[PDB]
Amino acid sequence: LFRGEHALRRYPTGEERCIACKLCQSACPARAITIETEPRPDGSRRTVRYDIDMTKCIYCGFCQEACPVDAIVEGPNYEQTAYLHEDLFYDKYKLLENGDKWEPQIARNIEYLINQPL
């Protein structure tokens, strides 16, 4: 359950889970999430902007609880110390690569958490 560094997930096919529902944006107590959406040319609704100010975030996990497709998560990583204030301005590239790097551990933890109610 540890709440660490945020990441954006994918389906096993490689498709983005996030459908730009903006529930995570309104769930944020710190107003750290900014989202902008346009219809992707194939027709699916995806974010053209999804960024989180990590200097505003309080690491509360309200956004990962609000997500209905388990797209945004808080990973296990805590060694995210930065030398510049601009290194903590997380855009979609950073969250996507964080998800693509930390996917096995996040998947294992989420698998156990899902099986807990069952």
Binding site: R10, Y11, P12, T13, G14, E15, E16, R17, I19, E38, P39, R40, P41, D42, G43, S44, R46, T47, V48, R49, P68, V69, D70, D91, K92, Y93, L96, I110, E111, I114, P117, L118
Partner: protein, 90 residues
């Protein structure tokens, strides 16, 4: 075919299309369109298919039901959560 032509717009939900699908790594900051296009069509025996985007509930997306009995026989349909496409078998 011209993506701004009447036919191309009409058969693309009135949006300007992109056959190369390589505009989305800049506009949408990812290559998910290419990856989902790499997945072929799933052919289902019945007239309706149920998608949850995974093997179990809560691992994927909420249960959705897609009609495969179309006005034109065998027209594939796309899940609106995951990009998987389904069609009625023959």
């Amino acid at each position: 075919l011209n993506p701004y032509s009447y036919e191309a717009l009409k058969e693309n939900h009135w949006l300007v299309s992109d056959s190369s699908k390589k505009n989305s790594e800049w506009t949408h900051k990812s290559n998910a369109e290419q990856l989902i296009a790499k997945v072929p069509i799933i052919y289902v025996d019945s007239n309706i298919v149920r998608c949850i985007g995974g093997t179990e509930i809560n691992a994927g997306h909420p249960q959705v039901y897609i009609q495969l009995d179309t006005r034109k026989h065998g027209t594939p349909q796309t899940c609106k959560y995951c990009g998987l496409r389904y069609a009625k078998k023959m």
